[PDB]
Amino acid sequence: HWGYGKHNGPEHWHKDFPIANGERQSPVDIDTKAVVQDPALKPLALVYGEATSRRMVNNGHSFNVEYDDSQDKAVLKDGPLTGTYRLVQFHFHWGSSDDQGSEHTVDRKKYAAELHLVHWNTKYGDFGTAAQQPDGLAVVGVFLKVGDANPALQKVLDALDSIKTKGKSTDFPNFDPGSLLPNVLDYWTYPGSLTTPPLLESVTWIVLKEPISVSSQQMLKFRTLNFNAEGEPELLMLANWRPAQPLKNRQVRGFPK
Ligand SMILES: [Zn+2]
């Protein structure tokens, strides 16, 4: 019953998911003057060479590109992390116009979209178990800044016609998730939550400082998706972002500064 409209949107999620008003909620605004250095932090290690994409799916809230996380195929290590995290899926958040859509903001600046690469700590054996633990998940966030068309990204947007409505899926093999990363991997990090229900406070957020590009024409395609299933009255997926939440006792750290 949750979504992003007037009566089911982020303001109302707390009715079914009281943790929405928790102490470690995401996204947040990254106040760059407040960012702290920490000598414990390392370079990110994105070990995506053997990444194996499987399918793309419209789940009525966004669309996900799913990865085979049966083995250590595409992993995230180092950065702020202890141990090894496996990539399970990535997905996007976007807005109804180009001036908004990112979930994290940077000194209150909003980008057109935000990509989330979701990973789980292999110490827990499976995603479901990892998801209930403070150190269980790690999500890399990447901003999409309107400008030049992005080839790579197009490679994803072309498949959207095959999954217009809720529950539809399409084969999507051999997509390199590294192709959607900036080449410089400087990051901000803070302890946070999933940005969609159930909003579990089990995420180590790693938000890249450098955006990737997307054109205005490309942004249109995200907005062609349907929230509804086929045979139901149309309700376009015009926007699917949660706004910034109170930072409360937390500090954002930056690497390398
Ligand atoms: Zn997300």
Curated annotation (Swiss-Prot):
Pfam family, one: Carb_anhydrase
GO BP annotations listed: angiotensin-activated signaling pathway; carbon dioxide transport; positive regulation of dipeptide transmembrane transport; regulation of intracellular pH; regulation of monoatomic anion transport
Gene Ontology cellular component terms for the protein in this record: apical part of cell; cytoplasm; plasma membrane
InterPro entries reported in the protein's UniProt record: CA_dom, CA_dom_sf, Carbonic_anhydrase_a-class, Carbonic_anhydrase_a-class_CS
Activity control: Inhibited by acetazolamide.
Function: Catalyzes the reversible hydration of carbon dioxide. Can also hydrate cyanamide to urea. Involved in the regulation of fluid secretion into the anterior chamber of the eye. Essential for bone resorption and osteoclast differentiation. Contributes to intracellular pH regulation in the duodenal upper villous epithelium during proton-coupled peptide absorption. Stimulates the chloride-bicarbonate exchange activity of SLC26A6.
PANTHER family xrefs: CARBONIC ANHYDRASE, CARBONIC ANHYDRASE 2
Protein name listed in UniProt: Carbonic anhydrase 2
Species: Bos taurus (Bovine)
Recorded name of the encoding gene: CA2
